[PDB]
DNA sequence: AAGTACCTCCCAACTACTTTTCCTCACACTTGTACTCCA
DNA sequence: TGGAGTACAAGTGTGAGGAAAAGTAGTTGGGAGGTACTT
């Protein structure tokens, strides 16, 4: 029994320390610090399938839309069939119709007999309660939410040979009360808006709410989020919402106020583990195992942990496992906006004290949220278990395994048309393109045989030629009229500037006509620290800023060279400015900005403080 | 924020070191079905250096320099606003042990008043001081007297013998009656005495009854509240004045110390008894800085108390708030008394005025404390080492107060004393004096006296000096014979000395005083408790260290020098 | 007592010229550090300034009373911009709006430590447009830019010139492919253009509306690569890009590198949660965090109860308590950009339909959405990106 | 995506949350004449309730004095149309000078629709925008076993100024599990009781944002989980220094008297102090009078915190370890 | 240059005014002068 | 004057809803300019 | 081919909201205490 609690709860947050001390001095440890030691643990999943299938909000009342759990038939009493693993899944346009057996993988059946049963009223749930685990034998019937009524099915009469599994339904009664009804749980029980009711389900497949009643309606829940269970099985039941529990024996008269959370917590699940001691709860921030009593077994307030991510759309699931000393919980919080799990390992023990040792997480497909994610509980340090996954804008029913040792729709039905009025104008393009890249494919081939040759020394100081005359034009373009206080083309010769291959002579003949200004009226800029903005790295020379070009496409391009070639060459005519006037073109226009511009902007134009 | 204050820093904001008295309140009401817990503050007092509160106390000496001290720092006063300041010790009359005084100066209270008396003075087990004189009249009415806020007031002695504990006037009798009908100077004293009583109070004759009377008269000046009727308004008197050495459940053994004090008091009217002097460091105790320091902080939340009350008094003359399961109300009365109990307690520290509206048991208000000058370390130190004798004694110019007394011998020393007006007033300790703080246990004692040959005294039914008073602490509680405690007095020396049981300290004291004609009264007396003096002496047998007060030392003969050590004399 | 006391939120006029004081200053703070490592010669710094002294009568033509002077951070960028379209630089806002949020040149929280002098006599309503208010996003950066060339003739006066050829080129070294696609697109910009050559940007002088013909200059050519990016491997007969080349194609691409410019990509995945897989931050390695975490390091330059967080400082150094990987660590052992380029053409090694155009419909996934990232636009407005490209040409061809 | 340090307001959102608890302020004054019959307009939804001081949310223990027999009276669709149109008919008049979604958030939250916008992911501050990614980033590691980065993404996220209280001190385990040139963990919680040494009381009527209570303010009845965090870092700190009678010392010179564990923590420091020394090395007066004391100072220190609140021990076996420190003297 | 000295901390910190009396290395209150180079002149007697 | 009357002497927790008024665009009205079944 | 009817080129018109620090201001912690009241 546990030393260092207080009654009204039991703490243990997230990685801090906790708060008690056995105090045990017989050479093994004298002290319980709860964060225990162990060796890592990491989570792998098993990536598999198992079968196929407003703008800024998201409704509370959608809780689950499909369901796998161990639950067993009628006819397989009498017969040593123990336990059955049948399926249901939401189908349909808008998910409205409804339709296995564990060899290696998790899998649909064998011979595909499923009964895509028609339900006129949509899905918003598919869940069992399942039975307790102390009564013998399993529960046979599920009860499930249509947006219209709320049926009843029994699970009757399945066999081997054909795999197949149909069920007896009840005619389900209508709202005669028009309120939503929130979740159904059996363990007619109902939770609708404003009430809850208890009801003897029938016992024939061929042809009631008792007259004892209360409601449950808040003002102060702005949302519509409920979820009800029952208490330890002795006509007492859990009402909740995000605020407070309901605990109701309706044989009594006894309404308990315990969970007092309207202040600063919102419930997003809650959830009755299978040992009916204890029960957990995953509302907001927090994470509570809270336990059974053994004098008047009402509730107590047990073991709890914070939670400390900032969701609020986290179901939960848990999963216990036997192992010959301590028994284990997990804790899946799956989101609707996002991918991340948060978890807990726990050990319950006998006499009521129990440990935690660690929180672990893992990620799922980027394409997609999950919206639905269900264990398997296996007929009942290495960290293994499993689970299934169903995601949001995802369809596809996969399976994953936790062992321990995409495209958007805004792109496919725009590009690559139908269009067969211009199906080959495109398609000409595509051959359009190759008419000039093969235009444009020998012209430097005849420049890979000229290399630094003699009918291009023709060219190579008529480049300086050409280059030299057209220069004082632009130079005396302006003086005569320089006074303009209200440019650089170098687009001045015309042959093709794209007939001659030498890469050290063309930047050192354009860089030789630079000097050749050393006086005013033009100013020039550089290319080797320039243009350094494709590269993201330095430039020492404009050979080796090429050879970076050059060592980069050796084998992707047509023999290496020859698309290489007037790719920087085409950038020293593309970064042609190099004839803007000197300083006094710039200067004098400065002046008269900064005197007709009056007194107050003087210190309008004024850097140089600090 | 809060942080750690160091005495170092104290001297130089000439700021007092003071540090703050929480003192959490009982507000209950309505018969004590609702009850209030309010932690309040009540502003910083004065805290002594190298005390528990200190921060210096499991200090290292390279510790000490490390914050700015001497490597041997005394400690052990105040530091007032920088001027380092310390509560003088004074000699007051021991604890726990009736003494037989003489005095002239109760001839001015009337006529027929004698001359003679028994002066008590019982202290609490929280220190606070209490004198129960019982005098002597020529008329045979012996009257009791005590002293309640600042007033003195007179009882008939077996108006209190009949309501300590609930007897007949033949069981008060034949109580005092214990042997020595024949003695004609018992048995004659004693007639008036019974029978003024009979004549004075004949309607009063049972202890509930007599309690009707006591706790009328003695109502409005005790302040009691009207629920409490007048016989438990004389019950409190009971056990607030009345030898508070137990207070309550000693009704009975409060009753066998009244039979002590008057069969001494007639053993000294005769004259069998010679007087004791107050003066002789034999029946003078010291009065510590915290034991004075522990009772003045009583007081001063003794005048808080009754400030509440005194504004709730002033919320009577409105009909403003009758609210007293009210939270906020109280909260409206506490911010508005004057609850700054820190000048109140530093203003006692440095002025020297010992300020009550209640009023203590000593005489004196002026002169508590001094200032611990620097002028040297000699004059330093010699601070927390003086006694002062008492302020009233520089009135008497007769100097016995003042003259050097043999009993001083390893107490007092000799020759440490100041010249001029306080020559002998200011005499300061010894080497080796080293004074009990903490008591002892007493629980084992009985226990043991009981097994020797001390019957106990409820069973007995006997007195006078022909037998041996065995005393614990002022609690009477067997009757031997002369050469009994004799042998006693050497046989509880062996049992302590050596390892027999902790019950047992060595701090404590065994005055066997023997018997002697017509000189002190013979008795074996046994002090533990708090403010004694004890110095360290060899005893000869089984020779181990052993601790003697100055009331074992007037009947015992301690040699100086082995060489000097002379046979059936020397046991020390 | 009012003697002490200045700096009251009263400053009639001369706050107006605060924001006209202040944002030259930390203008000057802005190009001069242009030239120490962004490498821009002198030419870029001596250009910047009649730009902004044309930029005053813009709010001077305007009447003093109410005259609203409508500034943003983004005019520093604005007028940093014609510094650049003018200047013919192989520069385009993908190097400005990365830059941002690695915050190299000081853009974001100018107020913090720039001005120095020039914080405490503004009024607290201009001052959510001197500091780093938010980010720009959903093309807010190209449309400050309409409020920049357009009232006064940057066209006629001066040349808006995106070197055209410099956009495709640039694409081609951001995602390791075959130099074929440079020459590739080239006659499909050409083939969409009354008047072919050298296109020209959106001005603004009368109207409040986004470009729904989307005339941006530099988003044209973002969209002229989203076709062609289609063309080569599923029109084609000639099936030169083989067919084991296609699965290191799209999935080598998206896998994530550690250089330094794609370190730096990712905080503008961090900056705009809007873009799917912008929290792909989950996904990250050691030395690519502390690199992040170094990235803080020049963060944390513009980014008495003091001595207690001395202590906060003390019991937590940002340098490792013993022996970290500063002095006695590697030299030279950083992953390049000539490396993540060479790497993949070494892994997509090999050069010599369903399985196909869906298979090349990946890569349509991963750089018609890396382009998303690139200049922090959304995808409903790639679609007035694209609707005015494909059916314009479906409308000239004919 | 986890809960943020952040002290941000906004225009928009702070709106729509007045919009928000002013609804209720018409939806509960209905509800007082349906559940009897049958100037800021916050504030007064705030006085409705206690705020817990504990934790999270405000409990009470079940089998007790709690109790009420449930309402039998069905709520249905003649009672549930009518809490809903006197509001709508009246809280309309905010919904035509407000934004256009706060038209958009109001009319949504009465049918269901949970709000996909969370409101400070989008918020692009570029300085409250960094402060998010790395806090996600702050639990990966932790989450992933790997303590040489998520030490050091701690240091970078304390120098950006806007990070608040809750981040400050839950998550320094990652000085407790460095442990190899540490800064030894112990040190750190020091200061942070050492600034924020207040002994207000709760203050139970501020409009609670940026932070929650029960972690990280020291009010009274229940103190700051900051300190006791703090004696039982050291005390097993203590226990692995073989400190004792230094460590005893300081709970003696704090008066929290608001609260029962820190003195059942007291209640040990003298319980394993007369561990070691209750042996003596003997197989002989000099202990015996120090063991002596040191187990009626637990007698006396685990009864005073039966004195106090709520700490539920197992009293049987508690008590037979203590008796039997002192029969190891016999 | 005038500076003080503070008591506790021992970091010797200037005072301009309009200042807190006050330590700024540590929190501390109480605070003393040092002295610089000035000339005083002594008989050695 | 005789002990109340009790009114205040009086700062300010963490921000509370204000708060300084500035600034980015949203979201479709207009009738040809286009591409077409009856007439 | 001359005349429609629904899809759609193309100009200018309405109001209406996110930025978040910036300093002031919402109740009870707060901050102390002898001066200020005519029944």
């Known amino acids: 029994l546990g030393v260092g609690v207080q009654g009204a709860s039991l703490y243990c947050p997230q990685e801090n320390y906790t708060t008690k001390k056995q105090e045990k001095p017989q050479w093994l440890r004298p002290v319980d610090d709860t964060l225990a030691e162990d060796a890592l643990d990491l989570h792998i999943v098993v990536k598999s399938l198992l079968c196929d299938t407003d703008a800024f909000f998201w409704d509370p009342t959608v809780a689950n839309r499909l369901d796998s759990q161990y639950i067993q038939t009628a006819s397989d009493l009498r017969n040593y069939r123990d336990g059955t693993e049948i399926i249901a899944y939401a189908s349909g346009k808008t998910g409205s119709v409804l339709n296995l057996t564990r060899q290696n993988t998790l899998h649909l059946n064998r011979h595909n007999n499923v009964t895509s049963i028609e339900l006129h009223s949509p899905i918003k749930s598919i869940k069992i309660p399942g039975a307790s685990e102390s009564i013998g034998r399993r529960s046979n019937l599920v009860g499930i939410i249509t947006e219209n009524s709320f049926q009843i099915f029994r699970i009757e009469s399945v066999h081997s040979r054909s795999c197949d599994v149909m069920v007896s339904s009840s005619e389900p009664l209508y709202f005669v009360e028009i309120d939503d009804l929130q979740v159904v749980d059996f363990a007619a029980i109902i939770d609708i808006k404003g009430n809850w009711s208890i009801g003897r389900i029938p016992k024939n497949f061929n042809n009631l709410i008792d007259n004892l009643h209360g409601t449950i309606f808040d003002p102060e829940e702005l949302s519509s989020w409920k979820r009800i269970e029952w208490f330890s099985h002795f006509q007492k039941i859990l009402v909740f919402d995000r605020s407070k529990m309901i605990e109701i024996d309706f044989m009594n008269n006894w309404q308990t106020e315990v969970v007092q959370a309207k202040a600063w917590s919102n419930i997003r699940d809650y959830k009755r583990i299978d040992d009916k001691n204890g029960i957990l709860l995953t509302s907001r921030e927090i994470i509570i195992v809270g336990a059974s009593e053994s004098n008047d077994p009402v509730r107590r307030i047990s073991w709890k942990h914070d939670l400390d991510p900032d969701d609020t759309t986290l179901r939960i699931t848990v999963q216990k496992v036997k192992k010959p000393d301590h028994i284990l919980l997990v804790a899946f919080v799956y989101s609707m906006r996002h991918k991340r799990i948060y978890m807990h390992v726990f050990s319950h023990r006998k006499a009521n004290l129990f440990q935690s040792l660690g929180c672990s997480t893992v990620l799922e497909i980027p394409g997609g949220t999950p919206t639905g994610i269900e264990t398997i509980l296996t007929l009942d340090f290495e960290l293994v278990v499993d689970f299934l996954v169903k995601l949001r804008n995802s369809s596809e029913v996969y399976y994953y395994a936790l062992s321990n040792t995409v495209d958007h729709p805004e792109w496919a039905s725009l590009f690559n048309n139908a269009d067969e009025r211009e199906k080959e104008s495109i398609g000409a393009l595509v051959s359009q393109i190759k008419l000039k890249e093969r235009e444009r494919i020998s012209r430097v081939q005849n420049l890979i045989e000229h290399e630094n040759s003699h009918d291009e020394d023709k060219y190579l100081q008529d480049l300086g030629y050409r280059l030299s005359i057209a220069t004082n034009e632009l130079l005396e373009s302006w003086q005569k009229t320089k006074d303009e206080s209200i440019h650089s083309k170098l687009k001045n010769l015309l042959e093709n500037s794209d007939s001659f291959a030498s890469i050290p002579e063309f930047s050192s003949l354009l860089d030789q006509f630079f000097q050749y200004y050393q006086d005013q009226d033009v100013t020039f800029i550089g290319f080797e620290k320039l243009l350094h903005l494709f590269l993201h790295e330095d430039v020492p020379g404009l050979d080796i800023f090429y050879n970076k070009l050059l060592q980069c496409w050796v084998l992707v391009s047509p023999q290496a060279e020859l698309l290489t070639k007037e790719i920087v060459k085409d950038i020293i005519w593309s970064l042609a400015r190099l004839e803007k006037p000197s300083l006094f073109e710039p200067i004098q226009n400065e002046i008269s900005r900064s005197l007709s511009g009056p007194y107050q902007d003087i210190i309008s134009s004024w850097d140089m403080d600090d | 924020v809060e942080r750690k204050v160091y005495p170092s820093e104290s001297r130089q904001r000439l700021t007092s070191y003071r540090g703050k008295l929480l003192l959490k309140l009982k507000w209950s009401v309505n018969n004590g079905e609702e009850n209030l817990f309010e932690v309040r503050d009540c502003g910083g007092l004065p805290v002594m250096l190298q005390s528990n509160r200190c921060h210096l106390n499991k200090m290292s000496p390279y510790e000490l320099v490390q914050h700015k001290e001497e490597s041997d720092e005394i400690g052990g006063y105040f530091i007032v606003n920088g001027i380092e300041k310390l509560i003088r010790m004074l000699i007051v009359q021991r604890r726990n042990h009736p003494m037989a005084i003489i005095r002239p100066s109760f001839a001015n209270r009337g006529a027929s008043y004698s001359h003679y008396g028994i002066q008590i003075r019982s202290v609490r087990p929280d220190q606070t001081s209490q004198t129960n004189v019982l005098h002597y009249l020529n008329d045979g009415q012996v009257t009791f007297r005590f002293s309640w806020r600042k007033n003195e007031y007179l009882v008939p002695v077996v108006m209190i013998l009949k309501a300590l504990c609930h007897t007949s006037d033949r069981e008060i009798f034949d109580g005092i009656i214990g042997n020595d009908v024949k003695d004609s100077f018992l048995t004659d004293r004693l007639e008036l005495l019974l029978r003024g009583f009979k004549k004075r109070y004949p309607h009063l004759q049972n202890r509930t009854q007599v309690l009707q009377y006591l706790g009328d008269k003695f109502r409005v000046v005790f302040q009691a509240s009207p629920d409490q009727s007048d016989l438990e308004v004389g019950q409190e008197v009971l056990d607030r004045i009345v030898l508070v050495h137990l207070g309550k459940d000693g009704s009975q053994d409060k009753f066998r110390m009244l039979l002590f004090m008057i069969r001494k008091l007639y053993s000294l009217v005769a004259g069998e008894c010679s007087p004791d002097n107050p003066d002789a460091t034999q029946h003078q105790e010291v009065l510590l800085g915290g034991f004075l320091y522990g009772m003045i902080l009583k007081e001063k939340i003794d005048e808080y108390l009754q400030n509440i009350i005194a504004q709730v008094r002033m919320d009577i003359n409105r009909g403003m708030a009758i609210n007293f399961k009210d939270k906020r109300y109280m909260s409206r009365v506490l911010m508005r008394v004057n609850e700054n109990i820190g000048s109140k307690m530093q203003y006692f520290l440095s002025t020297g005025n010992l300020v009550s509206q209640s009023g203590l048991d000593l005489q004196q208000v002026s002169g508590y404390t001094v200032v611990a000058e620097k002028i040297n370390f000699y004059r330093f130190i010699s601070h927390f080492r003086m006694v002062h004798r008492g302020s009233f004694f520089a009135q008497l110019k007769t100097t016995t107060v003042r003259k050097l007394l043999p009993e001083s011998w390893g107490f007092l020393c000799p020759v440490h004393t100041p010249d001029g007006s306080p020559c002998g007033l200011l005499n300061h300790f010894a080497h080796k004096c080293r004074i009990s703080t903490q008591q002892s246990d007493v629980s084992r004692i009985p226990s043991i006296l009981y097994s020797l040959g001390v019957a106990p005294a409820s069973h007995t039914f006997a007195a006078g000096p022909s037998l041996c008073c065995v005393q614990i602490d002022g609690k009477i509680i067997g009757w031997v014979s002369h050469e009994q405690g004799k042998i006693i007095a050497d046989t509880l020396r062996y049992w302590k000395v050596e390892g027999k049981t902790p019950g047992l300290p060595i701090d404590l004291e065994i005055g066997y005083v023997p018997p002697s004609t017509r000189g002190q009264y013979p008795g074996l007396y046994l002090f533990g408790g708090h403010s004694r003096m004890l110095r360290p002496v060899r005893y000869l047998p089984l020779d181990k260290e052993d601790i003697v007060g100055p009331f074992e030392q007037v009947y015992m003969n301690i040699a100086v020098t082995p060489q000097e050590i002379q046979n059936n004399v020397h046991t020390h | ?398 | 995506m986890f809960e943020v340090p952040i002290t941000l307001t906004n225009r928009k959102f702070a709106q729509r949350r007045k919009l928000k608890y002013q609804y209720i302020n018409y939806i509960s004054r209905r509800f007082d004449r349906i559940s009897k019959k049958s100037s800021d307009e916050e504030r007064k939804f705030w006085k409705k309730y206690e705020k817990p001081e504990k934790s999270f949310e405000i409990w009470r223990t079940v089998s007790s004095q709690n109790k009420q027999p449930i309402n039998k009276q069905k709520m249905t669709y003649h009672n549930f149309k009518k809490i809903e149109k006197i509001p709508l008919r009246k809280m309309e008049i905010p919904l035509l000078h407000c934004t256009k979604e706060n038209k958009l958030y109001f009319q949504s939250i009465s049918r269901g629709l949970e709000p996909l916008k969370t409101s400070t992911s989008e918020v692009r501050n570029y300085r409250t925008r960094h402060i998010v990614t790395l806090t996600d980033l702050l639990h990966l590691n932790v989450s992933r076993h790997n303590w040489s980065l998520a030490y050091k993404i701690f240091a970078t996220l304390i120098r950006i100024p806007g990070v608040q209280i809750k981040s400050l001190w839950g998550i320094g385990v990652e000085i407790l599990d460095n442990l190899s040139n540490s800064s030894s963990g112990l040190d750190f919680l020091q200061w942070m009781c050492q600034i924020y040494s207040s002994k207000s009381r709760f203050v139970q009527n501020i409009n609670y944002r940026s932070i929650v209570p029960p972690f990280q303010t020291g009010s009274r009845t229940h103190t700051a989980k900051f300190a006791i965090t703090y004696l039982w870092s050291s005390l097993i700190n203590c226990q692995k220094s073989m400190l004792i009678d230094k460590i005893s010392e300081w709970v003696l010179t704090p008066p929290f008297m608001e609260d029962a564990e820190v003195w059942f923590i007291y209640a040990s420091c003298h319980l394993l102090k007369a561990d070691t020394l209750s042996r003596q090395f003997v197989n002989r007066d000099i202990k015996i009078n120090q063991v002596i004391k040191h187990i009626h100072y637990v007698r006396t220190f685990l009864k005073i915190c039966l004195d106090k609140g709520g700490f539920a021990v197992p009293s049987r076996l508690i008590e037979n370890q203590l008796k039997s420190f002192e029969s190891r003297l016999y | 240059t005038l500076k003080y000295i503070c008591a506790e901390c021992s970091s010797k910190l200037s005072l301009s005014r309009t200042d807190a009396v006050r330590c700024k290395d540590c929190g501390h209150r109480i605070l003393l002068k040092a002295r610089t180079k000035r000339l005083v002149q002594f008989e050695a007697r």
């Open chain 3, 1 to 398: 007592r009012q003697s002490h006391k200045k700096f009251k939120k009263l400053i009639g006029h001369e706050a107006k010229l605060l924001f006209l004081k202040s944002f030259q200053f930390i203008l000057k703070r802005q190009i001069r550090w242009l030239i120490t490592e962004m490498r821009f010669p002198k030419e870029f710094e001596h250009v910047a300034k009649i730009i902004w002294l044309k930029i005053l009568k813009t709010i001077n033509d305007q009447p003093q009373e109410e005259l609203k002077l409508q500034l943003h951070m983004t005019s520093t960028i604005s007028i940093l911009y014609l510094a650049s379209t003018h200047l013919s630089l192989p520069v385009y806002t993908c190097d400005y709006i990365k830059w941002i949020c690695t915050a190299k040149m000081p853009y974001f929280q100018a107020s913090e430590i720039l001005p120095k002098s020039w914080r405490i006599q503004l009024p607290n309503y201009y001052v959510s447009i001197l500091e780093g208010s938010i980010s720009p996003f959903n093309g807010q950066l190209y449309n400050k830019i309409a409020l920049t060339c357009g009232m006064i003739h940057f066209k006629e006066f001066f040349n808006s010139e995106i070197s055209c050829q410099g956009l495709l080129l640039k694409l081609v070294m951001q995602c390791a492919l075959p130099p074929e696609f440079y020459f590739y697109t080239k006659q499909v910009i050409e083939f969409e253009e009354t008047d072919i050559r050298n296109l020209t940007l959106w001005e603004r002088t009368d109207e409040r509306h986004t470009g729904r013909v989307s005339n941006h200059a530099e988003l044209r050519v973002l969209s002229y690569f989203m076709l062609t990016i289609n063309w080569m491997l599923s029109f084609d007969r000639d099936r030169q890009y083989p067919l084991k080349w296609i699965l290191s194609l799209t999935e080598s691409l998206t896998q994530r590198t550690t250089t330094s410019e794609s370190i730096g990509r990712n905080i503008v995945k961090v900056v705009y949660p809007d873009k799917p897989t912008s929290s792909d931050y989950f996904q990250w390695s050691e030395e690519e965090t502390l690199e992040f975490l170094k990235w803080m390091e020049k963060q944390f330059l513009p980014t008495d109860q003091k001595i207690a967080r001395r202590k906060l400082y003390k019991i937590f150094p940002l340098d490792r308590e013993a022996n970290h990987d500063g002095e006695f660590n590697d030299s030279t052992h950083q992953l390049t950009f000539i490396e993540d380029l060479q790497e993949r053409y070494a892994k997509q090694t090999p050069f010599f339909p369903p399985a196909r155009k869906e298979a090349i419909g990946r890569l349509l996934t991963h750089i018609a959405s890396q382009l998303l990232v690139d200049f922090a636009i959304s995808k409903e407005q790639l679609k007035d990106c694209i609707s005015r490209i494909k059916n314009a040409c479906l409308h000239r061809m004919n």
